[PDB]
Amino acid sequence: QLHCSYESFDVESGVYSVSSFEAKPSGSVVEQAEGVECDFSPLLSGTPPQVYNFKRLVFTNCNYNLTKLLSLFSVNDFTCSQISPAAIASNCYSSLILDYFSYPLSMKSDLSVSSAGPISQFNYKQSFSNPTCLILATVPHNLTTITKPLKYSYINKCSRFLSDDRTEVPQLVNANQYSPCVSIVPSTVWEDGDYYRKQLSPLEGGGWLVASGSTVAMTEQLQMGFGITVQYGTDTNSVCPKLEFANDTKIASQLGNCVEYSLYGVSGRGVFQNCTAVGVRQQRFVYDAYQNLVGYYSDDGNYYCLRACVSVPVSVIYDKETKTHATLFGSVACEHISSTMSQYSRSTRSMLKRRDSTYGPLQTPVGCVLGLVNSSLFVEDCKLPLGQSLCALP
Amino acid sequence: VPGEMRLASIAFNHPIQVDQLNSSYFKLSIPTNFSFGVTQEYIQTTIQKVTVDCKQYVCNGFQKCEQLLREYGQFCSKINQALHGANLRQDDSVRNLFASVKSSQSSPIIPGFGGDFNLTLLEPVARSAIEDLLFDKVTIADPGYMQGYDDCMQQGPASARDLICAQYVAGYKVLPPLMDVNMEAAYTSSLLGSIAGVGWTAGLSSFAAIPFAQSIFYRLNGVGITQQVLSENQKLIANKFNQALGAMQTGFTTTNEAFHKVQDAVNNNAQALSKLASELSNTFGAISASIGDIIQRLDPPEQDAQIDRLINGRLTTLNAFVAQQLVRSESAALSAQLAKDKVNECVKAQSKRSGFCGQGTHIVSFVVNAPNGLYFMHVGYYPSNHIEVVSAYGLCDAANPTNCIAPVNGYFIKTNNTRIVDEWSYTGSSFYAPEPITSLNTKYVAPQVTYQNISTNLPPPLL
Amino acid sequence: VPGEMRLASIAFNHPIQVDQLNSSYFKLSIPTNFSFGVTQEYIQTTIQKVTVDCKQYVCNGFQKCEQLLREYGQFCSKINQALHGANLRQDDSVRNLFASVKSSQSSPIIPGFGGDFNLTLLEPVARSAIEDLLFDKVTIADPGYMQGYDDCMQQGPASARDLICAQYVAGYKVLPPLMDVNMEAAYTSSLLGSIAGVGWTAGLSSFAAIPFAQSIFYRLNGVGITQQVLSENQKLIANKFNQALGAMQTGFTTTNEAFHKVQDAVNNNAQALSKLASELSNTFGAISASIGDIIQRLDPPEQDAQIDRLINGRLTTLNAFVAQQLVRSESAALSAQLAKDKVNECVKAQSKRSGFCGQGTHIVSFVVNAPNGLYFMHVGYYPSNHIEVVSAYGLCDAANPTNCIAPVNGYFIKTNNTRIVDEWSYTGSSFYAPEPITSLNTKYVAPQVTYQNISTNLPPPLL
């Protein structure tokens, strides 16, 4: 590594830094759960809403397997903004939200989360603060408990007339909100190009609510769409994929020095310790001013502190005059040192072994070193000081 | 409830006025009282030495970023080389400083050194109690190296708050100081051993090996205090001296600016490390500060768009950091040169320059170890109770115009003392202490019109 | 082949201890041997001066660039102005330095100058042998401007690898040095001829015109060596001096730290140019590093987007470059001020303050031209073989405690020499050498209790 950094076959003698050890990671434990299967029965019957009438299901505290739902419909459009679709299925969340509606596929050209179509202008919008997904699908012939709208319908305009009869105020739909115009529009649009109006209250300054809409012919199989968003959180993450914890065989309280973990869907890696229990109790985790996890409350009544894991710094002593080298592992000390490392740094360290395969490691006041030899000599200047009073002679 | 703040004029002290006089004689101002006192200075000599890992700071073993990073691997190479050169410069300055600190020879040092002078600076044979007071007053984080790594590890208290355990997260490495505090203690004791002294010519070969008090009296005569005064007041001098020294126990306060500078040297180092740590959490518009998190959440074709944003901002922080370190390193080197200069002047000898050292003429000064630098103390001489007297430019024999004399390091003043029958008397220039005029305190000079014409009794020349 | 490296403690060289005696007399340490020796230092005074064509660095005159840059034309003006000012500062510093280097008068210089001393620094009547040793050891590319154009061009050797001809591609220009090297050599010959006078009540008004050796002897009495010793050892002195001088031919190795600094100054100048050159190939995500490639393959709506991206990164590196030059130029100016101070102290005259110059008291020093700066050499005195002797604060007539004496620039020591019948003897302070006490070596002082009481034979004064 040193030769490559200097683009040469002859690095000047000195002590040089090299990349650190990864500190030997180990298998995962989790503290997720619990909850019951998320009831998805509202989607199994009746007619789905017009694009301005959306149904919503908030899911908390429950378990899911979305592929079970996928088997129920043929999906003709799958897309997820800011998240892979595989991940959104496997992720655990503070909430899961599903919006669902009837939607002809003739209108699919006008719908994407970023679309400029009238469906997104006036009937539905999604926040981009949260990752999203979209699904378009149709009903199988054996799902007849679900039924068709007389016609598919949508609002293609939503604005309010100014009270002075010369100007008009447009009203694009707000993300995650019903358009205001829904208060006047009928549950279906009776005819394409129908429009409606309501006088605004005097508290609104007067003027008129205005809206208009359009329809699409009914189809042999019902066509529908879905909107999906998710919400991140910490100790609120009770929505999860169905989980199986068999043969961990143990979770928290089993140590460990570096282990992978997830707690309520919060990933990390580290070592835990049995410690006190600073407040606030039952707040799930605990964080520092830099938003790094400090520790965590558990259902065994034990507060665990978290130290992440500790990497090992490395440096190399290089003597170009004799073409020899030696190493220092720093403050880590020889007690964590072994003849080989799984921790790990570079694929081999055998060049050190050319002499050090035959000797034990040597502790020094700065730290453990390899191939140094304790001569107890006193020399005024090694031109290779190791810091403090340490000195490597050529 | 406290009173309202009060607007006020800034005071201006006026110098004591001395009216100019015409003719062959003039008014002279001389102190009649004095006190020892001290001043202090802190000269930083080093920047804490650190190195970084452009491979651990940017990303942490994720294979996707490692491959992305390879296109930028040369930036890390520049970073590492630059930091390495900065650290070499820091070690150069240390060795260069010590080369002047060392003396070819010194006195042994024992307790009770300095006689009646208190000398609290003596080691508890050790460093010194004064150096330890400084270290206790300093708010610096618990030290590195041993036990090090095991204070990051669960085998210690949950209350540790050291950035040093974060050293093993951030990829920071803190290099050890070259000097080794025990060798440092040896060097400062060696400087105390060079005391007594510098006087007696150059002092650049020979070593006088005399009692401390004697070197002090020598310095006092070097500022125009008469030898006679020094012999009469010997205990008084030691008493005033130790009062000034005793004040050092109150010197470790926030109003002591030298002390304040020491604390800010520590503060600056801590801040630099905290900056890099805080940036680990800084998204650059990336979905998360964690690389593993964005990998887990994203399909790889989109995944590295996010990774790229994150990598570039992390590299930018490292570049800024290096530039800052290079600047600070250079300022330390220059500051170290100043320290070396004062060691070879303000400490190794009495100085006539004013300016350097505390503002009270100059008398012996001392130096002790301080974090990242040297801390100096300067004993000084502060005049008080100035009085005005009549004085003459010189004297001559009125019977022979070529007999003309002038005082050496002192003045001829009209006598105001009942012990002296002579109309004129010699005084020291640092203190009012009239005495008879004798050949020891005067020299022959060419005649001048302003010299007084003495028609009667002058002993130098008798005729 | 060689074995394992050996761990070792860093040695601490202890000062020679001298016991602190407790009565009217004391141990005194004095060297019994000495040697000449030298030290060297390099002080940069200038940096290479460059200018940059701000159109050529960015583009090769392709017309799309000629229009696109109009939006950014003020950046170039700022770049040119900043670089131009930096170059003006370098010229100011050079003129200021030479203004004090010159002397109103000097000795003519001839072969055989300095008598028995070898004086290899003398010009080969050119520059000097020492200056050429330095220039040959330096790895810097040969300078242009007479012409060097044909080492770029097809009218020359295929082996040229000079950054100099890359200057005609990148639009770099290295400015010629402010002065002809021959004039600079003349100024240092004037410095050689400025020796002798070396003193005598400022000497700015005069020139002693005396032999070099003669001026050296005055310098030697300036450090407390007695004259009698000097007269007897003159040939010995010349031999030791020339051994120290001869070592300079082996001094030009990389193990010489001052030499190493010279090479790095050269390395830095070349390095700055290479940085700019490497950036010419740095794509900024543009389809190619070449503007012409971008033009040849693209429809103009895309072509211009690619070119602007390329331009923005090119300008950004120029801005960083300018900032780097401004910093280095400033540090050079400060360094030049230091050199000026040393020339008017450490070189033109002996200095007693220590610290400065070589670490061996001070005796004459020399300076020669070096790339981008001055290279100083300092002759110095190193004491050796120290012994302890008995000494007294002063001597007196026990019959008349109203007149006592003390040595001038020397000490009173108990006699250990069979030649001298006297109980006490004078010595030089730089070198052990007993002599009878005479009025030339003494001054009258006020009496003190620690002075010895001689009740019999004391000739200075007998009465």
Ligand SMILES: *[C@@H]1O[C@H](CO)[C@@H](O[C@@H]2O[C@H](CO)[C@@H](O)[C@H](O)[C@H]2NC(C)=O)[C@H](O)[C@H]1NC(C)=O
């Ligand atoms: C010279 O002045 C000093 C201080 O100005 C005198 O010291 C006295 O010190 C004691 C101890 O702190 C104080 O309580 C007194 O108030 C001081 N006296 C005065 C007048 O300030 C010292 O005595 C003076 N020496 C003389 C006049 O010979």
Ligand SMILES: *[C@@H]1O[C@H](CO)[C@@H](O[C@@H]2O[C@H](CO)[C@@H](O)[C@H](O)[C@H]2NC(C)=O)[C@H](O)[C@H]1NC(C)=O
């Ligand atoms: C002078 O030195 C003496 C010691 O010889 C110091 O006296 C000690 O001071 C410490 C610090 O408070 C006390 O813990 C000891 O009890 C003191 N010794 C005795 C015997 O009481 C003293 O502080 C020094 N300074 C001055 C101004 O006297």
Ligand SMILES: *[C@@H]1O[C@H](CO)[C@@H](O[C@@H]2O[C@H](CO)[C@@H](O)[C@H](O)[C@H]2NC(C)=O)[C@H](O)[C@H]1NC(C)=O
């Ligand atoms: C007596 O004092 C006077 C002045 O106080 C001395 O100076 C003389 O002053 C006059 C007036 O300017 C000059 O013309 C004389 O030339 C001065 N004398 C000399 C020697 O220059 C005067 O010398 C004194 N008489 C003595 C010392 O005998």
Ligand SMILES: *[C@@H]1O[C@H](CO)[C@@H](O[C@@H]2O[C@H](CO)[C@@H](O)[C@H](O)[C@H]2NC(C)=O)[C@H](O)[C@H]1NC(C)=O
């Ligand atoms: C006095 O000093 C001289 C100068 O250093 C000494 O002479 C040199 O001694 C070294 C010691 O190894 C030899 O290598 C040199 O060859 C000697 N040079 C000459 C010109 O003699 C001398 O030995 C010293 N004498 C004493 C008694 O210390």
Ligand SMILES: *[C@@H]1O[C@H](CO)[C@@H](O[C@@H]2O[C@H](CO)[C@@H](O)[C@H](O)[C@H]2NC(C)=O)[C@H](O)[C@H]1NC(C)=O
């Ligand atoms: C200084 O004296 C040295 C002798 O050490 C001279 O160097 C030698 O000069 C002779 C000329 O007869 C050459 O043949 C040798 O090769 C030289 N020795 C070397 C280069 O190591 C030198 O010429 C003298 N210089 C001056 C200016 O007097």
Ligand SMILES: *[C@@H]1O[C@H](CO)[C@@H](O[C@@H]2O[C@H](CO)[C@@H](O)[C@H](O)[C@H]2NC(C)=O)[C@H](O)[C@H]1NC(C)=O
């Ligand atoms: C002889 O030497 C002594 C010291 O060894 C001189 O000093 C005297 O020392 C005693 C005791 O310390 C004091 O009481 C006297 O006051 C000292 N003398 C003076 C003048 O202060 C002593 O003076 C010498 N005798 C001579 C020169 O005749």
Ligand SMILES: *[C@@H]1O[C@H](CO)[C@@H](O)[C@H](O)[C@H]1NC(C)=O
């Ligand atoms: C009745 O309704 C409208 C606002 O909705 C307004 O004209 C009137 O102020 C309301 N009555 C009262 C008492 O506010």
Ligand SMILES: *[C@@H]1O[C@H](CO)[C@@H](O)[C@H](O)[C@H]1NC(C)=O
């Ligand atoms: C360890 O945790 C258990 C609860 O799981 C608790 O009872 C015990 O006191 C803890 N021990 C320490 C030393 O904190």
Ligand SMILES: *[C@@H]1O[C@H](CO)[C@@H](O)[C@H](O)[C@H]1NC(C)=O
């Ligand atoms: C190395 O040698 C020194 C010499 O005394 C000895 O004290 C020490 O115990 C040895 N071992 C280590 C690990 O330092």
Ligand SMILES: *[C@@H]1O[C@H](CO)[C@@H](O)[C@H](O)[C@H]1NC(C)=O
């Ligand atoms: C005062 O000084 C002036 C200076 O010009 C001089 O002319 C004059 O003689 C002096 N004496 C008096 C009494 O003015």
Ligand SMILES: *[C@@H]1O[C@H](CO)[C@@H](O)[C@H](O)[C@H]1NC(C)=O
């Ligand atoms: C000599 O020793 C005595 C104590 O025995 C001490 O008081 C005196 O100060 C000493 N003289 C010096 C240090 O000159």
